[PDB]
Ligand binder design. Structure first.
Ligand SMILES: CSc1ccccc1CC(=O)N1CC[C@@H]2[C@H](C1)[C@H]2C(N)=O
Ligand SMILES: [Zn+2]
Length: 139
């Protein structure tokens, strides 16, 4: 679990979105595993606007942060899941690193701010859904 709080928006994994997230829906993209809902309180997270390929992510299954190198956002095999079936996540970045399913929602950050959230992985990989292209989150 986990979310990004920026302005009057809450960014979560679409597969973990709650009833309240869907009742206050702003945008969702099944192909990206993202959902953005509106909030009453103002969030103070900063979204990164960059092309960094290195950062640090939080891994709840180890209670640890790990530094990683990750690929640029691209279309990639997501193993047909319970929430979804086979298809290629768009805007997904991969790194070598530990992850388990509840790891989804952990934040990946670079020196510029939030880059994305854990969204795929397995067999020694970890996938992050990029949010740097969502320029509207800042307004
Ligand atoms: C960190 S995910 C993971 C980690 C180790 C082992 C297995 C997984 C896979 C997993 O259970 N997933 C959650 C639901 C859907 C795909 C990934 C998500 C998507 N974005 O399509
Ligand atoms: Zn950066």
């Amino acid at each position: 679990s986990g979310a990004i709080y920026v302005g009057n928006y809450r960014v979560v994994n679409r597969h973990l979105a709650t009833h309240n997230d869907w009742a206050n829906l702003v945008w969702e993209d099944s192909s990206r595993d993202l959902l953005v809902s509106s909030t009453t309180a103002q969030g103070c997270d900063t979204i990164a606007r960059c092309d960094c390929q290195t950062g640090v992510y939080y891994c709840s299954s180890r209670r640890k942060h790990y530094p990683v190198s990750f690929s640029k956002p691209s279309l990639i095999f997501v193993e047909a899941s319970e929430y979804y079936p086979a298809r290629y996540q768009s805007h997904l970045m991969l790194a070598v690193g530990h992850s388990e399913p509840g790891d989804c929602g952990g934040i990946l950050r670079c020196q510029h701010g939030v880059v994305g959230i854990v969204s795929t992985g397995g067999n020694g990989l970890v996938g992050f859904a990029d949010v740097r292209d969502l320029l509207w989150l800042d307004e």
